[PDB]
């Protein structure tokens with residue numbers, strides 16, 4: 159069965175990681191405990207790519223590409239490749255891992271997105287050639303998890319589109335991640351070391367700020383990240399009375415739709431947090447530390463906040479806004495007690 | 505009488521600069537020739553603030569805060585002020601320039617945005633207390649330009665919103681920019697220098713890439729900036745059949761609204777391009793190089809691309825889309841002929 163994740167690129171990496179005997183969810187993502195509030199907002203003029211104040215959450219920390227590489231000793235590097243050389247690079251990558259292949263949503267018929275290339279590009283994992291000569295594409299997104307066959311012709315049609323709004327033209331992420339059999343024996347040892355290192359970064363609770371052409375990017379780590387996030391998201395309660403009207407302007411229905419999109423993107427991050435925290439718990443139990451840390455369930459607290467984000471996205475009103483904030487405050491407080499307990503035991 | 509520009513913060517800065525004998529449109533913005541395409545796109549994972557691929561244009565280059573500080577010997581300083589120090593900051597800043605005071609759209613009643621704090625915060629220039637106790641606020645955006653009165657009570661309440669989605673509570677940009685007597689006379693000298701420095705940067709035509717938590721940010725300077733923009737903007741032609749197709753789900757309808765927003769944002773940057781270009785013309789004259797560039801009107805070319813964008817909001821079809829594309833290639837063409845002549849004429853001395 160095909161592995162999946164709330165972020166489809168992580169699902170893809172998980173399938174690839176399994177080929178080389180690496181458990182991404184448990185040993186890589188689960189080994190990296192993180193909690194960060196991120197804000198894009200007005201800073202120093204000019205910032206022409208700053209289209210709106212924007213807030214979200216991330217439990218990805220450094221991210222799986224940096225951690226998958228670190229821990230396997232291998233390599234997760236991105237690159238554009240010319241159409242003549244694409245079919246071969248796929249077979250070449252599969253030997254030592256695999257490829258994340260970027261295409262538009264309209265290039266994947268199962269996505270049902272013919273009339274639009276999507277807000278962001280999509281990603282699939284090519285899994286070798288079937289008897290027919292048609293390629294096997296692994297879909298990493300939980301909503302469409304599985305295997306889809308696509309003719310070879312369509313694969314270069316999909317990977318080199320015209321026009322190319324997403325600059326997706328033959329873009330590939332190359333996972334060269336096969337651990338040497340000595341490194342492979344060190345995986346749980348290294349996972350336990352990454353586990354402690356992320357917990358220390360979490361409790362260090364550092365703050366940061368950068369000025370970019372897309373705006374000022376603010377971030378805050380650690381136990382205060384979710385209380386700071388909730389405080390900031392209150393600023394969007396104006397969406398509730400606006401969305402309860404049926405006679406919205408064109409300009410006003412745009413406000414609502416971007417605010418709603420802000421809450422969809424956050425909901426996917428809460429799903430990811432629940433997925434990561436489960437991986438951490440499986441890593442903890444496999445390390446034999448579960449009985450020492452206790453029965454706290456940060457993965458469950460984040461799942462409830464995910465569901466509550468879904469509920470807000472479907473019906474953007476004040477009761478569901480307030481219920482999201484309260485589910486997030488609960489996840490913040492189970493997180494910090496679990497983090498402190500787990501670092502103590504390590 | 506109130507100055508204005510298509511970006512509200514630029515119109516606000518023009519008003520503060522006039523108070524200290526500096527013509528922002530001519531000596532600061534007109535003295536910074538620039539052309540740049542910006543893309544935000546997928547880069548290294550993870551990038552949680554990367555919500556969509558996005559492309560836009562900028563003729564602002566380094567931007568007026570850097571230029572206006574350099575040229576005046578002063579500073580353009582951002583700061584959050586506690587409530588009990590806002591009025592005194594407003595009064596104290598006015599002697600050396602003034603203040604861009606940040607505000608939610610709903611704080612400014614003339615914006616008719618009571619329902620929303622806006623996608624972005626707004627800025628106004630407080631302009632003293634009137635003999636009746638009321639405060640005067642200068643609106644620097646062309647569509648609302650003028651002076652509005654606010655009571656001190658409403659100004660304080662509006663400058664400290666709770667909650668504060670935009671993070672603008674007591675946030676001020678302090679423009680301490682009064683030139684010394686000697687600097688005031690060297691002004692048009694420095695405006696001449698900045699014009700050449702900016703022209704040389706435009707032809708250096710460098711590009712860059714940064715990886716941020718908001719995505720990979722790609723930029724390109726030079727004569728290739730507008731053809732590159734038109735190439736990438738072709739990627740959004742899918743918006744035409746998508747709009748007016750009446751079986752639209754919440755997600756595909758969100759795609760249409762964000763596409764239209766992309767071109768609304770772009771339209772403002774073309775109107776700024778026409779505004780900056782025109783400022784470069786008026787600077788080229790008091791400098792006396794008008795005759796030695798010919799009759800090339802980059803302001804007029806860019807103003808035709810601006811109008812071409814506004815057509816797109818009312819009707820978003822392949823024709824108006826291609827009309828905007830052709831208008832943009834014209835302005836890019838005019839821009840490189842004009843810049844090549846003016847940089848040669850500048851150093852001909």
Ligand SMILES: CS[C@H]1O[C@H]([C@H](N)[C@@H](C)O)[C@H](O)[C@H](O)[C@H]1O
Nearest residue numbers: 166263276277278279280281755
């Ligand atoms: C409900 S599909 C959701 O994600 C899409 C795609 N799967 C990603 C991976 O590119 C597109 O960005 C869509 O515009 C967005 O609404």
